[PDB]
């Protein structure tokens, strides 16, 4: 009924055609004596009757309760089940997740994922799948071995995640920078930059993004963009690469009036059905053709040191990540799955959507927190624009750099400049926000693309990226009355 | 005091120069600081992470009925480790807690586990130079890669064993790196003949960055590199100036010698079993202990010791040598998970450095007991002319079946006089009798310079002779006697001898 994807295999880098798995790789096989590879024997690895508490669904005072009481779901995980029926959980046993195989992630693990999907997007092809990693920075790492040979060119975002573009950068692939605004890629101008293209520059092959909740920039794709931006892939033939950690810091609607916002507080929660159907669509969800690859993780869902995540796209296209896995990563830590997968499958997909409501919850309450500070604390005018993130733990002071009434003089009209001394001047007062010059993408081509598609719109807009994931309401707040003590000063605002 | 590591940054791939890390990775350091309000980084609040009580049962040292036992009475420690600690006196055991473990942060690896390693380190090697160090890693596999991508451009060449482990081969080959095959005999590398490929290594071609070894219970050949060949295999690395990549998974598999007559080994067996210092004394030399210029680069795993899913090793090298693989990680892997960091270091630091060594004590046990059963069995069922040679290994999980192709009847008929064409007939003959091994072609190193080395650095020892590694760590010894009972006759049979 579906269609089946394309085969993209012409984007594969030379490491890729060239990489051939060991034939060292019927160790369960009843009539096979199994003197081939060197698997220990289970009877040796030292720990048996794992257990650990996580809190139970729905998490009825909060994700951050602490765990125990009633809001304790209790397990244990056994390294031999006698039978199927002493494991009713599903878990997978500590003997098969302590043993060599499954690179590609323990089949439970990856059942629960695929349920998860199912529920959360609508795949358009029929041959997708997933792959296990150790989380999305492990991810795009694969993703520039599988396709990009030195000197191939990638597009990005005009401000990106400083370490995607460091690992590009390293491995001497091209980061062609495309414009965003408050909405993320504007798609006129991508369209633009693609139809102006070089003749003799190589073609992108990729366009890296991170949709929801950018890094550093904390927008979002407007849907409508989302599907101009596909349709642009599909016409110039490059893949999408949707880096996607943030995903479900998708929040509540920003309400600026305090009597507004509490009567939108004292409602009802979201059930469900509400809040699936509040989420931002997918570019995995307008795949037609299996050219986007999308990067999950549980870092900012269960824990950074989780280091688990996985990959969705054709079955085609995993086919390279499968085999760069078996010769690098091995597979995700057989612990860390155990206990990832024994959590959710407690919780069910039904329960995990109960902790993802949750989470939504704390970072609304911490986005609200960042930017009432933000209204109060800035000078108020054109020149310090406030846009409030629908998504993501990032916020962005913006400051127009020719409003400092020594831009002209002291600083000779280079915003970069000016960037700096703020950077210091902030840290001087007792606050430490990013420099948005740390993330800002830079690429050329030989030959080099034309005027117009190195335009920037407002070259004189520097920013700093905060975040509100990490302190108390308290130091937050505090933190942002110090920066905006600094700018009035700075900028000669009474 | 100790002599500083020296640089050897000039071998440093392309890749490698042009990493550069963001002025970003200084801010996650300023996140406890109590004058500066830090709102630069992006670490989620560890109330959030949706686990506490970590809880596991391990056996106990000193293992008194062996490391396989159940683990329950007697042979069982239980241990839970928390979230958070109200204060460090709270965490009597030093246990990495969850919230830390599982947070952004460490990309080494925690300190716990760090340190753990390190007074481990200082026990089994004697080192020689001041700034060495540790960096954990996701297990020798990925050590590898990370090796290949700090040292490696494509088309750069380093040596290794004659035979070696497919799968290094094999990322080395999907990266473009060149590996010049360097002969082995039963103990090892044979260093005259490596010192001559150096000697007469042509002008004008890339000139090895490193040497690749598998030295204690190589991978196939099973063999460990004599300790005095050692001290001269280092030497021609000082002189050549490379360096030296030590793969190890297999140290901790080393045995006794293996003694033919029944009589003489249950005596021997009959003496009690060795106390800390015998068992220290009778560990083979490395050569992390010969560095004393930080040209060693050793790759430690836990894989073979506890568990392959553990998805944990490390590596050894100066301080000068680690930060480009540091780099990496950060762009990478990053740290190995937190989990498995909190279990492997929370049952390791309650057995402690002694219970360890009673583990791997137990270790050398049990592999030694698996190797005689398997030594046995190939001399009762295997031919015993002078075509079929059997190398009892002193070290690690496998052993070779070495046989001359030549004396085969339907040799120069069937298989038009080709070793290769034999070996995959017999391999195919082997599993049809319900036993797999393993034909040693998959582990045979293959390399080229241009311009060419001489044909001297090229020669093969007789490339009649055929092997097929066998491994006898995996199953019962019924099954693996079995085993080798038809592979033995298949034999008999296919030579008509
Ligand atoms: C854009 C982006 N991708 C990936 C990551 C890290 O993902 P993970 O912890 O799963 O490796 C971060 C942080 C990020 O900002
Ligand atoms: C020489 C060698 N190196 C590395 C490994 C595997 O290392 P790890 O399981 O630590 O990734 C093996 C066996 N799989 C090996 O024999």
Redesign the pocket.
Known sequence: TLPESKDFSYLFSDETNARKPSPLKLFQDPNIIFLGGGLPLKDYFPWDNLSVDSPKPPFPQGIGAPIDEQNCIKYTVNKDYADKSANPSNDIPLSRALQYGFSAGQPELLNFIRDHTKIIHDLKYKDWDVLAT?????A?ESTLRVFCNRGDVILVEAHS?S??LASAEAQGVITFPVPIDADGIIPEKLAKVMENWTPGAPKPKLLYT?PTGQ?PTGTSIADHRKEAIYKIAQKYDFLIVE?E??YFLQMNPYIKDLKEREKAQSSPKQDHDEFLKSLANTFLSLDTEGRVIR?D???KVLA?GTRL?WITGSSKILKPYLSLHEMTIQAPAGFTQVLVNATLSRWGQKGYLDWLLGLRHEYTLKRDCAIDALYKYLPQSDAFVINPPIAGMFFTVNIDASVHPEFKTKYNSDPYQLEQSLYHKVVERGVLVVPGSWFKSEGETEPPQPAESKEVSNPNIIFFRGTYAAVSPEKLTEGLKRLGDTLYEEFGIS
Not at 134 to 138: F, I, Q, R, W
């Open positions: 150790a989380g999305n920075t492990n795009w995640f370490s995607s991170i890094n880096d950690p943030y990067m993780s549980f870092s950074p995540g």
